[PDB]
């Protein structure tokens, strides 16, 4: 494992291309929270709008188009993380009988935080 | 909860009339007052012990008619596997 292993210097650094897009989506976000739409479209539109305005002000930004229309897979994960981080409170009150699958998923939640509070007690 | 379907569905069977299922289904005009007013779940179970079965045809219809089962109805529909 020392025979064929090369470190290709890629221009397209991730670790500062995970900072543009939490700017960028800073609407569609306040009803993903309240159960009312399932199906968050980026559109590539906004993206490009998005790049003229900091073009225009002196900051060097990456290729947003150049870099999704190359490799659109790892773009998926990159783009769900940032929404997960930045998720907005739900303004509706979740009730206890719409969805049935958050229920289960609530409820394990605080379970599995009740274990391991009672876990840490036990060892300190 | 195991406790909170226990004390509702006991409740649901030893109180039911013909009248509560005439109620949602806009039934006012023709209601009876020698067979609505008897229990339908009670006769149900005292075959069963006669004839010697083990099955009972529960209708999903009235749970939804009384109004301490509404939240026992909705949660048959979700997992009935517990």
């Given at each position: 494992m020392s025979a064929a292993l090369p470190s290709?210097?890629?221009?397209?650094?991730y670790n500062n291309l995970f900072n543009e897009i939490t700017d960028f989506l800073v609407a569609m976000l306040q009803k993903v929270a309240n159960r009312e739409?399932?199906?968050?479209?980026?559109?590539l539109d906004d993206i490009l709008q998005y790049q003229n305005e900091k073009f225009l002000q002196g900051t060097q930004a990456d290729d947003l188009v150049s870099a999704i229309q190359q490799n659109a897979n790892h773009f998926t994960e990159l783009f769900c993380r940032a929404i997960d981080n930045n998720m907005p409170l739900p303004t509706k009150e979740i009730d206890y009988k719409d969805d049935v699958l958050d229920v289960i998923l609530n409820q394990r939640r605080l379970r599995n935080e009740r274990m391991l509070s009672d876990r840490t007690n036990e060892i300190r | 909860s195991i406790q909170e379907c226990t004390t509702n569905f006991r409740n649901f069977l030893m109180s039911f009339k013909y009248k509560f299922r005439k109620i949602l289904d806009e039934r006012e005009e023709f209601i009876n007052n020698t067979t609505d007013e008897e229990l339908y779940y009670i006769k149900q179970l005292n075959e069963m012990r006669e004839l010697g079965t083990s099955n009972l045809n529960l209708d999903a219809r009235n749970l939804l008619a009384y109004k301490q089962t509404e939240d026992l109805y909705h949660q048959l529909l979700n997992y009935p596997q517990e």
């Open positions: 290709i210097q890629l221009p397209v650094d739409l399932n199906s968050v479209i980026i559109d | -």
